[PDB]
Enzyme design. Structure first.
Site, PDB file in Angstrom:
ATOM      1  N   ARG A 267       0.804  -1.215   0.000  1.00 11.67           N
ATOM      2  CA  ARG A 267       0.000   0.000   0.000  1.00 11.67           C
ATOM      3  C   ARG A 267       0.840   1.270   0.000  1.00 11.67           C
ATOM      4  NH1 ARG A 267      -4.275  -3.544   1.663  1.00 11.67           N
ATOM      5  NH2 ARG A 267      -6.248  -2.400   1.892  1.00 11.67           N
TER       6      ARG A 267
ATOM      7  N   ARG B 228     -10.677  -9.988   2.011  1.00 11.41           N
ATOM      8  CA  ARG B 228     -11.868 -10.454   1.308  1.00 11.41           C
ATOM      9  C   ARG B 228     -12.265 -11.850   1.774  1.00 11.41           C
ATOM     10  NH1 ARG B 228     -12.469 -11.573  -5.228  1.00 11.41           N
ATOM     11  NH2 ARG B 228     -14.287 -12.938  -4.939  1.00 11.41           N
TER      12      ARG B 228
ATOM     13  N   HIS C 109     -16.778 -26.434  -9.197  1.00 13.08           N
ATOM     14  CA  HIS C 109     -17.212 -25.057  -9.413  1.00 13.08           C
ATOM     15  C   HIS C 109     -17.049 -24.642 -10.870  1.00 13.08           C
ATOM     16  CE1 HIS C 109     -17.177 -20.642  -9.193  1.00 13.08           C
ATOM     17  NE2 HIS C 109     -15.989 -20.706  -9.767  1.00 13.08           N
ATOM     18  N   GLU C 110     -15.978 -25.098 -11.524  1.00 17.81           N
ATOM     19  CA  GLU C 110     -15.693 -24.643 -12.882  1.00 17.81           C
ATOM     20  C   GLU C 110     -16.727 -25.154 -13.878  1.00 17.81           C
ATOM     21  OE1 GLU C 110     -13.342 -22.630 -14.428  1.00 17.81           O
ATOM     22  OE2 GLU C 110     -12.972 -21.898 -12.392  1.00 17.81           O
TER      23      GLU C 110
ATOM     24  N   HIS D 151     -20.084 -23.073 -14.712  1.00 18.69           N
ATOM     25  CA  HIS D 151     -20.109 -22.039 -15.742  1.00 18.69           C
ATOM     26  C   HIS D 151     -20.180 -22.656 -17.132  1.00 18.69           C
ATOM     27  CE1 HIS D 151     -18.748 -19.269 -12.517  1.00 18.69           C
ATOM     28  NE2 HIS D 151     -17.995 -20.293 -12.161  1.00 18.69           N
TER      29      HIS D 151
ATOM     30  N   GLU E 279     -21.877 -16.015 -12.212  1.00 16.17           N
ATOM     31  CA  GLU E 279     -21.035 -16.444 -11.102  1.00 16.17           C
ATOM     32  C   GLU E 279     -21.804 -17.266 -10.075  1.00 16.17           C
ATOM     33  OE1 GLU E 279     -17.797 -17.275 -10.366  1.00 16.17           O
ATOM     34  OE2 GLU E 279     -17.293 -15.208 -10.904  1.00 16.17           O
TER      35      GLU E 279
ATOM     36  N   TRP F 225     -13.245   7.068   2.953  1.00 17.06           N
ATOM     37  CA  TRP F 225     -13.025   5.647   2.707  1.00 17.06           C
ATOM     38  C   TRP F 225     -12.835   4.886   4.014  1.00 17.06           C
ATOM     39  CZ3 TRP F 225     -12.869   1.441  -0.330  1.00 17.06           C
ATOM     40  CH2 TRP F 225     -12.021   0.392   0.046  1.00 17.06           C
TER      41      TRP F 225
ATOM     42  N   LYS G 137     -15.541   1.962   6.607  1.00 11.51           N
ATOM     43  CA  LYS G 137     -14.943   0.644   6.789  1.00 11.51           C
ATOM     44  C   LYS G 137     -14.909   0.265   8.263  1.00 11.51           C
ATOM     45  CE  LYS G 137     -11.245  -0.949   4.280  1.00 11.51           C
ATOM     46  NZ  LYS G 137     -11.477  -2.384   3.955  1.00 11.51           N
TER      47      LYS G 137
ATOM     48  N   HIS H 274      -9.801  -5.912  -8.194  1.00 13.94           N
ATOM     49  CA  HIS H 274     -10.997  -5.661  -8.994  1.00 13.94           C
ATOM     50  C   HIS H 274     -11.215  -4.172  -9.234  1.00 13.94           C
ATOM     51  CE1 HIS H 274     -11.881  -9.869  -7.904  1.00 13.94           C
ATOM     52  NE2 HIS H 274     -12.642  -9.862  -8.984  1.00 13.94           N
TER      53      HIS H 274
END
Ligand code: NAG
Ligand code: NAG
Ligand code: NAG
Ligand code: NAG
Ligand code: NAG
Ligand code: NAG
Ligand code: NAG
Lengths: 248, 596
Positions: free
Chosen positions: B151, B255, B356-357, B360, B384, B459, B463, B487
């Protein structure tokens, strides 16, 4: 040839064996309309013209009587009550090349629906709107002829299936190609039913001393009674006599 | 002599033309992911420019068609997507700022640097170096430096670049008859032309916020419990009155909290649900791992996988000179060509990732009959969520025992289910507040009513309130840490992940109800249920032809975003959490105490 340039050939005056086709173990969409495959050999009709073209696997079902769509409506139309058979098999290993086989073209647009059994080859272009196209592609020209893309890695549905079409119709002419009716070996000195080419009967088959001229087939003695038949597979004349019978 | 017929003629012409070019571009992309060469990158520009240029020409032609006389909805949706000007509205001088800025930032993000300043010993790329030092170590001092190693060395130089990115990408909205760039992303969920079923672009914000009121109480106990298990190794280094540090949430951005298994094991006395040693004993390979997944899909009712994948795609790492990345991704080359790109390995996650694949890939053939433009998901979230429902069922003990990976005799007691359920919540429920706040920041910042100086102070404030994280060290405004996330930096709509949880569980309850399974949802299974497969196949095949809102009514019958069928999955977990948090300080306000 391609679907937009399908060919129509003439086959007549010979014998074709459809039994080998059934057990070929290579056809994927062998479908017969108006006639069963088993009884296709015993009886034969005229007008045995055949068509050959390449159709993508997904749109194979479109080729059938009473079935419309894109290919069935703009490229090749099958008349209703169609009497014939269609044979299709995969051709991935040879009818495909790396980068896409851009050798087969098809009609994407047409002014009017194609009539059954119609061959249409043209250079003109479609008129989507009202402004005419003078040979220069524009917003409403839409050059109908587009080349297919057949890559070796394409899916089974998109694979180019090699397909041919067989048709049979009626005419006021002698019957065209039929199948060979499995001639059986003869037997002598026995009351055996016989069915030669055209004539049949029951009697004892024996040797004969009379000589036929090279252009006869069978012989009779009195009152239109056949008693001397020359088999075609041996060119030998044999006498025919009714076998033992009478009162006891 | 009507516009409707003219539009149909154009769409038919475009569909055959677009798919041919897409197939050529798609197949070239697959090779670069399997065999990287110095010439392969040069090939991308040759293929990419013509494919992108093709859409530009078609978009101009489709513009002159008026949209006020097309009663048909199938072509109305197709024309809406094809007429998206995109970068055409931008001037040539301003348009060149897109590729120039986008590519430079991509290279910057790909530079992995953990080399200590004034001590250049060595440092590896992102995958080998950053993940290992944070997901395994349990030292506060080095982790803080690792937090600053990215960062303050990568995001610092993005401040003058990211600001330039949002000022010119916000202008295209007006040229595109949109409110703002953030509102442009909301157009995917927008529905128009259907009475009663129309979905306003602004309806996404309220619906997302409305469903967040029932998530927070679950998160309050989840955060209260997870923090309690964090002070076991740090009784006094962190005060049990504020929130948690940012650099103790498993990942750099927190995440996913999967790495917290070692630190926050609920009950480690009894063995966990692991079959890694089970499959190696039976000598499992890549072929058998995927084959058992295929028969699971057909058992449900969906069509089985094709034949041009086993001998076409790659499973393991091929050769030694081939260093191409093999991240798990779904490939839809078109024209019946489908591939899966991933490196098979003998691990728990990869086994789940395999199931999972294919989800799709299965969805891709569902809308195959649809045209090229509509050959896509209903929205960015559907694609997704569809690929994750089976993964949840694949992890159930009942499914594992069916194949035989798990032991024949495995009791299902209280602690066994809580241990499994809680970890799923951490990686699903735990990330929901993080997903919502980041997307909210993207919408407000793209709106343009935010001066430069207050970009960063706002920001951090929410949070600490929503996510519940204290800043390990104060940072001044020059820092651009929010732009360091993958992302957000690379311009991917992160809202799809937030709707992923709401979509996967809504379908899970419907499918489980269709299977008439008796018991809780965590023990539910989808295999051996043809009725459930038919229900799923009915909505999957619709694709983009029908409105996405109509799809929900076909499975759960609720037109709105229902958040109720998510707590039901965690009802056994929620009850235990409430008792466990009897003394823990549940509910955090603004807290400057840890780093006042
Ligand atoms: C055809 O003629 C040849 C001439 O010798 C003969 O050997 C053959 O048996 C004939 N075919 C059949 C089926 O009898
Ligand atoms: C794989 O890549 C190497 C170098 O990166 C190259 O020499 C080789 O020809 C490639 N093979 C294939 C099948 O692409
Ligand atoms: C639009 O046209 C397509 C043409 O295939 C048709 O399938 C569809 O039902 C039509 N929908 C409406 C609402 O007219
Ligand atoms: C797209 O650009 C063209 C050309 O400038 C313009 O006529 C059209 O109105 C634009 N459409 C949108 C939606 O911005
Ligand atoms: C899929 O199922 C069909 C129908 O039984 C079968 O013919 C085909 O071989 C199967 N394909 C695979 C890859 O299992
Ligand atoms: C599904 O049915 C198969 C076939 O009988 C069986 O082997 C398997 O254990 C069943 N699985 C479940 C979860 O019922
Ligand atoms: C699970 O918890 C319930 C409720 O306290 C209890 O009655 C039951 O005996 C427990 N089961 C096990 C295996 O601990």
């Amino acid at each position: 040839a391609s679907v937009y340039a399908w060919n129509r050939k003439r086959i007549s005056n010979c014998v074709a064996d459809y039994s080998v086709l059934y057990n070929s173990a290579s056809f994927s969409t062998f479908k017969c309309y108006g006639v069963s495959p088993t009884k296709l050999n015993d009886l034969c009709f005229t007008n045995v013209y055949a068509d050959s073209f390449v159709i993508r696997g997904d749109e194979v079902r479109q080729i059938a009587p009473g079935q419309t769509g894109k290919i069935a409506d703009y490229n090749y139309k099958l008349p209703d009550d169609f009497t014939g058979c269609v044979i299709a098999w995969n051709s991935n290993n040879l009818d495909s090349k790396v980068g896409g086989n851009y050798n087969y073209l098809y009609r994407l647009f047409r002014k009017s629906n194609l009539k059954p059994f119609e061959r249409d080859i043209s250079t003109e272009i479609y008129q989507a709107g009202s402004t005419p196209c003078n040979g220069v592609e524009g917003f409403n020209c839409y050059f109908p002829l587009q080349s297919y893309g057949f890559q070796p890695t394409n899916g089974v549905g998109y694979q180019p299936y090699r397909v041919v079409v067989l048709s049979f119709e009626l005419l006021h002419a002698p019957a065209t190609v039929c199948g060979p009716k499995k001639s059986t070996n003869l037997v002598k000195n026995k009351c055996v039913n016989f069915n030669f080419n055209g004539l049949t009967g029951t009697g004892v088959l024996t040797e004969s001393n009379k000589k036929f001229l090279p252009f006869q087939q069978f012989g009779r003695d009195i009152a239109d009674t056949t008693d001397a038949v020359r088999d075609p597979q041996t060119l030998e004349i044999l006498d025919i006599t009714p076998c033992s019978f009478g009162g006891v | 002599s009507t516009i409707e017929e003219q539009a149909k003629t154009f769409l038919d012409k475009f569909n055959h033309e677009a798919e041919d070019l897409f197939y050529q571009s798609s197949l070239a992309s697959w090779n670069y992911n399997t065999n990287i060469t110095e010439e392969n990158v040069q090939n991308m520009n040759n293929a990419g420019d013509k494919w992108s240029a093709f859409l530009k020409e078609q978009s101009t032609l489709a513009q002159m068609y008026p949209l006020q006389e097309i009663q048909n909805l199938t072509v109305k949706l197709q024309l809406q997507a094809l007429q998206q000007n995109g970068s055409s509205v931008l001037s040539e001088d301003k348009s060149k700022r897109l590729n120039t800025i986008l590519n430079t930032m991509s290279t910057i993000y790909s530079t992995g640097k953990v080399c200590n300043p004034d001590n250049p010993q060595e440092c590896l790329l992102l995958e080998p170096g950053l993940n290992e030092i944070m997901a395994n170590s349990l030292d506060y001092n080095e982790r803080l430096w690792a937090w600053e190693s990215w960062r303050s060395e990568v995001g610092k130089q993005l401040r003058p670049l990211y600001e330039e990115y949002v000022v010119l990408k916000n202008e295209m909205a007006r040229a595109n008859h949109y409110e703002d760039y953030g509102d442009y992303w909301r157009g995917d969920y927008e529905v128009n032309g259907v009475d009663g079923y129309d979905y306003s672009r602004g309806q996404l914000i309220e619906d997302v916020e409305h469903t967040f009121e029932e998530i927070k109480p679950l998160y309050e106990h989840l955060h209260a419990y997870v923090r309690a298990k964090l002070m076991n190794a740090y009784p006094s280094y962190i005060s049990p009155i504020g929130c948690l540090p940012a650099h103790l949430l498993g990942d750099m951005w927190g995440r996913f909290w999967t790495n917290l298994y070692s630190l926050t094991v609920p009950f480690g006395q009894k063995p966990n649900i692991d079959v890694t040693d089970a499959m190696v004993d039976q000598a499992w390979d890549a072929q058998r791992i995927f084959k058992e997944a295929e028969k699971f899909f057909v058992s449900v009712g969906l069509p089985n996988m094709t034949q041009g994948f086993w001998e076409n795609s790659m499973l393991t790492d091929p050769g030694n000179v081939q260093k191409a990345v093999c991240h798990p991704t779904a490939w839809d080359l078109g024209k019946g060509d489908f591939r899966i790109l991933m490196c098979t390995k003998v691990t728990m996650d990869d086994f789940l990732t395999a199931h999972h694949e294919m989800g799709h890939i299965q969805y891709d053939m569902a809308y195959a009959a649809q045209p090229f433009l509509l050959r896509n998901g209903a929205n960015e979230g559907f694609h997704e969520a569809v690929g994750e429902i089976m993964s949840l069922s694949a992890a159930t003990p009942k499914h594992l025992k069916s194949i035989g990976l798990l032991s024949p005799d495995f009791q299902e007691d209280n602690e066994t289910e809580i241990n499994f359920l809680l970890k799923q919540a951490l990686t699903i429920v735990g990330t929901l507040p993080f997903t919502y706040m980041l997307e909210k920041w993207r919408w407000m910042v793209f709106k343009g009513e935010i001066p430069k100086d207050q970009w960063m102070k706002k920001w951090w404030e929410m949070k600490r309130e929503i996510v519940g994280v204290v800043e390990p060290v104060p940072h001044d405004e020059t820092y651009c840490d929010p732009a360091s996330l993958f992302h957000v930096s690379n311009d991917y709509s992160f809202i799809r992940y937030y709707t992923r949880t709401l979509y996967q569980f809504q379908f899970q309850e419907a499918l489980c109800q269709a299977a008439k399974h008796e018991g809780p949802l965590h023990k539910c299974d989808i295999s051996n249920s043809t009725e459930a497969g038919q229900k799923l196949f009915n909505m999957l095949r619709l694709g983009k032809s029908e409105p996405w809102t109509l799809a929900l009514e076909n499975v759960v019958g609720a037109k709105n975003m229902n958040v109720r069928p998510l707590l039901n999955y965690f009802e056994p977990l929620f009850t235990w959490l409430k008792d466990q948090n009897k003394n823990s300080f549940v509910g955090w306000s603004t807290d400057w105490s840890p780093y006042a």
